[PDB]
Amino acid sequence: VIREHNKWILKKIRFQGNLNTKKMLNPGKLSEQLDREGRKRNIYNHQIGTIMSSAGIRLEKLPIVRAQTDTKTFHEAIRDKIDKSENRQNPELHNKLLEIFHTIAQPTLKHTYGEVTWEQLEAGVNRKGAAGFLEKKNIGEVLDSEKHLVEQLVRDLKAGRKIKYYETAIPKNEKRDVSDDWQAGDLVVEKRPRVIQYPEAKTRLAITKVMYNWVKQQPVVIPGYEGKTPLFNIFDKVRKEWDSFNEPVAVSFDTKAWDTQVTSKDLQLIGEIQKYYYKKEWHKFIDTITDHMTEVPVITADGEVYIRNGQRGSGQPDTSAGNSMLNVLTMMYAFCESTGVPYKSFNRVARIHVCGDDGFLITEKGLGLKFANKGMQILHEAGKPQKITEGEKMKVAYRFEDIEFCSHTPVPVRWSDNTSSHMAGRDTAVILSKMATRLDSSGERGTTAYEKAVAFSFLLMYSWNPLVRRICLLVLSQQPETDPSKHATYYYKGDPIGAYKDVIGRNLSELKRTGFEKLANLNLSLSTLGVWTKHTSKRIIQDCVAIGKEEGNWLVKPDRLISSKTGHLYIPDKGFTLQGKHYEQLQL
Ligand SMILES: Nc1nc2c(ncn2[C@@H]2O[C@H](COP(=O)(O)OP(=O)(O)OP(=O)(O)O)[C@@H](O)[C@H]2O)c(=O)[nH]1
Numbered sequence: 001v002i003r004e005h006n007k008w009i010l011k012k013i014r015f016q017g018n019l020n021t022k023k024m025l026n027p028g029k030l031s032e033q034l035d036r037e038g039r040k041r042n043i044y045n046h047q048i049g050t051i052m053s054s055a056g057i058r059l060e061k062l063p064i065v066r067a068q069t070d071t072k073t074f075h076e077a078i079r080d081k082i083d084k085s086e087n088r089q090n091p092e093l094h095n096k097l098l099e100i101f102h103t104i105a106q107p108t109l110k111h112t113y114g115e116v117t118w119e120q121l122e123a124g125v126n127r128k129g130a131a132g133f134l135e136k137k138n139i140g141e142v143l144d145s146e147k148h149l150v151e152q153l154v155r156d157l158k159a160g161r162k163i164k165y166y167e168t169a170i171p172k173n174e175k176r177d178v179s180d181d182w183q184a185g186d187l188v189v190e191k192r193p194r195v196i197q198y199p200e201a202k203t204r205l206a207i208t209k210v211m212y213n214w215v216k217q218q219p220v221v222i223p224g225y226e227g228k229t230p231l232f233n234i235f236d237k238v239r240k241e242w243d244s245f246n247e248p249v250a251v252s253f254d255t256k257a258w259d260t261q262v263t264s265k266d267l268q269l270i271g272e273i274q275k276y277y278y279k280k281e282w283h284k285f286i287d288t289i290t291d292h293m294t295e296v297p298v299i300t301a302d303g304e305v306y307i308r309n310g311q312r313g314s315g316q317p318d319t320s321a322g323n324s325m326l327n328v329l330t331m332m333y334a335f336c337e338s339t340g341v342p343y344k345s346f347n348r349v350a351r352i353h354v355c356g357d358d359g360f361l362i363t364e365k366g367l368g369l370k371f372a373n374k375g376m377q378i379l380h381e382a383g384k385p386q387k388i389t390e391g392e393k394m395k396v397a398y399r400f401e402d403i404e405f406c407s408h409t410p411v412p413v414r415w416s417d418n419t420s421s422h423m424a425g426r427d428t429a430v431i432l433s434k435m436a437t438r439l440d441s442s443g444e445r446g447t448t449a450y451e452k453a454v455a456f457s458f459l460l461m462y463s464w465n466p467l468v469r470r471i472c473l474l475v476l477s478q479q480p481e482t483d484p485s486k487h488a489t490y491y492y493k494g495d496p497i498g499a500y501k502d503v504i505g506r507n508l509s510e511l512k513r514t515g516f517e518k519l520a521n522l523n524l525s526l527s528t529l530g531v532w533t534k535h536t537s538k539r540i541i542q543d544c545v546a547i548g549k550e551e552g553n554w555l556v557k558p559d560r561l562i563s564s565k566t567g568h569l570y571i572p573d574k575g576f577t578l579q580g581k582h583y584e585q586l587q588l
Contacts, residue, residue, distance in 0.1 A: 010411030012469050014053075015060040018189075029060065036327065044436045051474050052436060056383045056533025063179035063529060064433040066192040067172060071302050074171040077195050086263045086309050087383035094269050097329045100336075100343045101273050101454040103222050113278040114155070116212040117149065122584040128214040130315070130345040132200030133299040135170040139201045146202065153206035155306070165292040167197045167313050170301040176439050179430050180531055191583065197298060197308070198315020208317045210285060212276055215317045216585070221277065222325045223332070224352040224359070226406070230586045232460050232504065234353075235403075235410040235422040241362050243402050249368035250360050250397035251375075252404060253331055256385045258323060258357030259312035264294040267310055269329075270322045282305060318354060319582065328354045330384055338374035354404055365398075372396050401518050411464045411522070412515030415506055423464040425518065429525040431458065431468050442487040442581070448479050453580070456496050460503060460577065464514045465522070467532075470540045473500055477547055486580045497558050498575025503588055508558035509570065509586045539563070 002025065013028030020026070032040050046061055052059060054246050068074070081540035124550045129138030132156070139145060155162060171193030181188045208215055217227055226234060242248050255261060271290035275283045312319060335350065337342050346352075350363040363371070379386050386394060397403050400422075411425030435458050440450050455475035463466045476496050484491045492499035501507045527533045544562040548554040548570075557563045557570035580588055 003512055013500050016058070018060070021404055025135075030225065031435070034138060039443075042439070044453065045439060045451050046207050047475050047478065048455070049436055050472055050473065051540075051543070052432065053202060055536035056542060057432070058131055058531060061176055061529055061531045062433040062436060063182045063429055064175050064437050065178050065188060067189045068175050068190050069171050069193055074193055074195070074302075075300070075304075077171065077193055078169070078306070082197075082306075082308065082311065083197060084260065085302055086311075086312075087261055087385070088381075089263060089383040090381050093333070093382055094265050096343075097269055097333055098272060098396065100329050100332050100346075101276075101325075103344045103346075105276060106219075106221060108278055109219060109221065110281050111277070113211075113213045114282065115210040118209070121209045121212060121560055124579075124585060125238070126581065126583075129204070130168070130170075130198055132198070132202075133301070134166070134201045135202060137201070138400075141207060142205060150202055150205050150209070153202060154210055154285075156289050157206065158282065158285045160288040163203075163292065165199070165203065166297040166299060167199060167253070167308075167315065169195055169197045169298045172196045172280075176390055177263060177433060179433075179525060179529075183234065183525060187410060194314075196315050197296075197313035199313075199317070204315075204317055207289060210282060211278070211317065213273070214277060215321050216253055217324075220352070222321065223328045224354050225324050225328075226355045226359075227320055227324065227584055228352050230460075230503070230585050230588055231406065231424045232431065233409060234405070235408075235424060236569050237305070237404070238353065238362075238405075239400060239410065239422050242403075244351075245362065245364055248367040248400070249365045250362050250400075250403045251368055251372050252360040252395045253354070253357065253395070254389075255327075255357050255379075255384045256387045258327070258384070259314060261317075262310070262312040262323075262326065263383055264310050266326055266383070267293050267312075267322075270318070270326055275323060284323060323356045324354050327357050327359055328352055330379070330382060331359065334375045334378045334490075335361065335363075335367075335371050337378050338371040341367065353405065358447055360397075360403065360404055360405055369396060371392075371530050393426050395554060401515070409518075413464050413511060414513035414515075416512045417511045418449050424461060425464065425526045426462075426523055429467060429529055430532050431462055431465060432526075435468070435471070438466040440485070440487045444487075447482075449482050449483060449486035450487055451475055452478065452482075452496075453484035453486065453491045456484055456487040456492050456499070459496070459500060459508075460490055463500070463504070463511055465519070466559075467523075467537060469508075470544050470556075470559055473549060473559060474540075474543055474547070476512070477554070486578075486582055491578055491580055493576045493578060495573045495575035497555055497556075497570060498572040499577045500558075500575070501572065509560060509563070509571065512560065 011026060012030055015029040017026035017028045031044055035041055049059055083426045088327055089162030131138045172412055178188050194397050217225060267290055271286055274286050296308045296310060298306050298308050332346050341349055343467040350361050352361040353359050376386055403409055408424040408426050410422035413423050440446055452475060455472035459472040497508055544556045545565050548556040548562055548566040548568055553571055555570055557568045563569055
């Protein structure tokens with residue numbers, strides 16, 4: 001019981017309290033917070049957050065917390081992962097790994113790679129790209145002015161000269177999924193930070209500029225490199241391979257802290273593979289740069305300095321390519337050595353998919369489990385320790401939907417024309433989490449021109465999720481005469497629904513059904529964690545109907561269920577899908 005002149009505060013609570021105070025009342029949390037600089041910004045996306053709160057969705061219950069950027073733990077991070085000797089690896093590992101590479105190399109491109117125009121390096125670049133402990137300017141600023149300094153770096157490197165190489169190590173500030181944790185007792189309030197180790201935004205532009213093709217894997221030369229592959233159509237092509245086996249089994253790759261496991265010889269092996277695709281003139285640039293990465297001096301954000309014995313530095317330009325190639329080769333290596341299947345014969349009995357250290361392969365039940373069992377040991381001595389599990393063997397999948405990749409598994413979808421396909425699935429709880437806390441930082445206070453680009457982006461990815469799909473449609477119904485933001489993953493031109501068709505291949509309205517028992521599972525956590533109420537679904541459905549009832553062409557009617565209830569369809573006008581300020585150019 002609180003005093004009257006104090007109840008006014010209550011008009012502002014928007015979430016249950018988390019203080020867990022025991023002798024002092026803790027009414028609730030407010031919708032806003034305080035900037036690291038004192039300002040008062042929002043926690044979630046307004047439009048989206050509001051719609052979700054309409055139904056019994058409790059934003060405060062979404063498995064999402066921030067990472068601890070404090071130095072105390074930031075150091076505990078370095079000490080717990082990066083502080084390690086290099087993994088002992090069997091002798092011929094790198095010879096036999098190189099051997100496997102040659103069985104997959106394309107002679108057509110051998111020694112054909114060269115430098116690139118500032119005009120393509122500049123394409124899609126994240127300008128606000130870090131600076132480096134001893135560097136004043138960031139990417140963009142370097143691009144604006146010191147563009148010349150970068151050209152001599154390239155020269156000094158091509159000539160294999162002196163270069164004071166070093167990396168800055170800072171804890172990555174970001175919100176992290178804690179779904180698993182909360183699903184079990186551990187109600188963590190925040191999670192350990194990832195240490196980003198990176199070159200100096202000059203040395204970055206220098207390396208990237210000449211090695212654009214390998215790094216940006218334009219001609220994709222890495223077996224099963226799913227890196228430039230949009231996520232919303234990968235399982236369809238993977239379903240193909242699955243269906244091409246008699247008793248298919250999928251085995252996932254689970255290296256514990258990949259980056260932390262790359263050896264010097266691993267880095268050298270990629271150096272070689274790199275020299276295979278680059279013209280002889282650049283081979284010294286590669287040797288010089290590779291030589292430095294074998295032992296890097298690292299300056300932490302607070303001043304400390306450690307001499308890392310070259311593992312991988314997340315901020316290095318060659319992380320995606322390097323890690324991927326190195327991953328496939330090592331997995332291919334392990335597989336063959338476990339089954340006996342000749343290196344050269346891999347593609348005869350197996351199909352592989354890799355994205356960094358993330359990936360899996362598909363083979364017959366026989367070979368597959370022989371690999372999962374003998375792979376633990378073989379990989380371990382190869383220097384890529386697999387996460388220890390109760391099963392004692394690599395994670396095997398006997399069902400297609402049980403295939404996990406890039407934090408997603410295949411969700412079955414039934415189209416109106418009685419055909420099927422699979423989309424990228426994930427626990428709803430998490431989709432909703434990321435959809436509510438993704439705030440774009442084109443710094444801006446965010447529009448409704450950004451929340452639309454986000455909803456559109458989540459539409460392409462999760463149309464198979466009714467709840468999520470409808471939330472998007474509602475957001476997209478707002479302010480029709482205001483184009484979407486380009487600061488989201490994808491954005492659209494013309495009609496959103498028209499655009500959906502553009503990349504998905506089918507129209508939203510043609511989406512007739514979602515695997516019952518798959519969707520069912522992906523919604524289980526929503527209750528365990530009490531994220532929604534037994535009326536949310538109903539409510540969101542009503543929210544939609546309301547809008548699409550009256551005669552007119554409403555973009556909320558592309559949802560079959562809503563359509564049948566309002567009796568109206570939605571006739572799309574053309575639309576086109578596009579990326580925004582990009583990471584790795586997806587080839588849509
Ligand atoms: N196939 C595919 N995978 C992608 C794509 N974009 C990101 N991924 C992967 O998907 C995983 C999950 O990413 P998300 O949680 O959606 O996005 P995020 O930006 O990495 O995460 P937060 O910003 O912290 O919310 C990532 O770890 C990447 O491996 C894409 O276009 N295609």
